Design a protein around this ligand. Structure first.
Ligand code: HEM
Ligand code: HEM
Ligand code: HEM
Ligand code: HEM
Lengths: 141, 145, 145, 141
């Protein structure tokens, strides 16, 4: 589980995230489709072209969950558990992608929040996402 | 490798990269954030905190060196493979570093590039650089087969 | 890659390899054992339970189909880039399958052969398959890189 | 997180492993090192010729190790932890390796239990070993 120090470190960094949760959501989203094209297949009905209505909706719905996660870290098993049902039985997402969004975020933070994005913080967002990720993949097993 | 128009993008951009300092912080950032990695770097000294690492003088010089390989790989994209021949031997067949980890560092590098250069490192750049590190993942990996 | 003693060892074996049922068992297995592989085999029918795809006819049939295409390259261990050029393509640009699943079915096949062959399939033996499955894999992944 | 079938599968299979475990863990490793050499740096002390009672006495406590975990399926988090810390904080074992051990363990049960290794079993045990690995990493500090 997440060290107190990390917990505190998200809240801060994502505190910064601020009212910007779902821009950065659409930004990690889009950095991922290009640098990992494969991952598009999962999002067929979209119009991926830059700043597209629907990506921005996904931009935010995602980032809003993350948010809700940043809320109760002690129970990520549960406050995300609905999403683990979807992401595995309805969509079936090959785990590998979870890292790829993870990575996508990690960057996007850095592009916009250099000075808060210290190493011990980077270490942290990660331990958070790697966290996040597993939750979202509990049901494959 | 890359549409020569693409090359000009990864290239025009390395022009403005302070390889030195990316270098230090890359390896550090990796050492701090993927602990197991440390193990291969335990003749470096104390790496028991964030600070330990980020500060440690060895980490730093070994990082200038490890961007040099890139700064260097960059010169010769069209045959990464060949350019990397030796280092590829060094890591695989007497260091025995699992290739998953050329990626991880690959990525952390990106992450440090994005920090340095802001929204100027757009995803169209990055989509590029991510092949470049995928490819430098590929040359260092080879002698595993 | 594949020493003079290796390149034969495998194919003296392969020779006794029931290429045909293996793939159908291999297949349902990738499918039973690793649910996210089913996305690409949607249009295949009931997969909803091990029984389903342990008895599903296209599975049964695509099992072999793969194996041939496998076992042909088993007989080509020099040029796999070649043998798998436009299988690598179908799987990348078209089917758009994450390279890891190669390594999955890969391994999985190794388990298959090691059920069908008992004590007979030694640590020696498979250690050699390891770098064939893995061999075949970078082949299937080439037309990404 | 598992099932009841799953657990009933792990069990029976591992009861039909039974007093073999020690001799199988043994094998586990030999395949491992021999197939994926880079797992031999984690044992520079080891004699790695067939049989080396170094190997043998090890395959055991892996098998004693697992036998403990099959037993406590309803909570691997706890019963293992002691082992997890070591395998990470101390040993520092590039998580990638447990993928390579799981597989070895199976291939090892694979020819030792054909008329036993039905899909659902291969589905259950793998699944099982997933959680075991995903415990011995739990502490990625
Ligand atoms: C950080 C990891 C992720 C988070 C926090 C996340 C969050 C979400 C949430 C909350 C939803 C549901 C919104 C709704 O109920 O409509 C959703 C939908 C969806 N997610 Fe994710 N997601 C993540 C990763 C991924 C990845 C990596 C993929 C595939 C590459 C993916 C595929 C999908 C798909 C296909 C939908 C359905 C949207 C639609 O078709 O309307 N998710 N995501
Ligand atoms: C793409 C990534 C990498 C590149 C380009 C790279 C390149 C280099 C270079 C230029 C050297 C110095 C040459 C020498 O002193 O002989 C080196 C040495 C070394 N590398 Fe890396 N390397 C990479 C990744 C890694 C990784 C990921 C690890 C560990 C996980 C690693 C472990 C080492 C070690 C232990 C040395 C020797 C250290 C020493 O001499 O004290 N390398 N590598
Ligand atoms: C492990 C080695 C593999 C081999 C030897 C292989 C071989 C083949 C072959 C020979 C075909 C038929 C070509 C044709 O259409 O004429 C094919 C198609 C296909 N492959 Fe594989 N492949 C491999 C890996 C994978 C993996 C890992 C997946 C997904 C998890 C996959 C998914 C597919 C799919 C969905 C088709 C099309 C079948 C259809 O029409 O429904 N392949 N592949
Ligand atoms: C299936 C998961 C694993 C289990 C159940 C397990 C179990 C154990 C146990 C109980 C010990 C020490 C206890 C004693 O000697 O009395 C140990 C030691 C060790 N293990 Fe494993 N381990 C696992 C995975 C791995 C992997 C994947 C590797 C690397 C490929 C590894 C490498 C080591 C090393 C380097 C030691 C300490 C050296 C020594 O005993 O002298 N372990 N393991």
């Amino acid at each position: 589980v997440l060290s107190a120090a990390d917990k505190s470190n998200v809240k801060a960094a994502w505190g910064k995230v601020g009212g910007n949760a779902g821009a950065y959501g659409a930004e990690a989203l889009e950095r991922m489709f290009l640098s990992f094209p494969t991952t598009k297949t999962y999002f067929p009905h979209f119009d991926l072209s830059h700043g597209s209505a629907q990506v921005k909706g996904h931009g935010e719905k995602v980032a809003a969950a993350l948010t809700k996660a940043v809320g109760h870290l002690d129970d990520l098993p549960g406050t995300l558990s609905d999403l683990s049902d979807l992401h595995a039985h309805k969509l079936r997402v090959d785990p590998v992608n979870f890292k790829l969004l993870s990575h996508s975020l990690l960057v996007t933070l850095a592009c916009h929040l250099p000075n808060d994005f210290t190493p011990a913080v980077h270490a942290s967002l990660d331990k958070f996402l790697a966290n996040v990720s597993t939750v979202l993949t509990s049901k494959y097993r | 490798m890359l549409t020569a128009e693409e090359k000009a993008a990864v290239t025009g951009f390395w022009g403005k990269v302070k390889v030195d300092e990316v270098g230090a912080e890359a390896l550090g950032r990796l050492l701090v954030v993927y602990p197991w990695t440390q193990r291969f770097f335990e003749h470096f000294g104390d790496l028991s905190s964030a600070d330990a690492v980020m500060n440690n003088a060895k980490v730093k010089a070994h990082g200038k060196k490890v961007l040099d390989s890139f700064s260097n790989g960059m010169k010769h994209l069209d045959d990464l493979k060949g350019t990397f021949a030796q280092l590829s031997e060094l890591h695989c067949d007497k260091l025995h570093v699992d290739p998953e980890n050329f990626k991880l560092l690959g990525n952390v590098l990106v992450v440090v590039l994005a920090r340095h250069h802001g929204s100027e490192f757009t995803p169209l750049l990055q989509a590029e650089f991510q092949k470049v590190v995928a490819g430098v993942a590929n040359a260092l990996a080879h002698r595993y087969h």
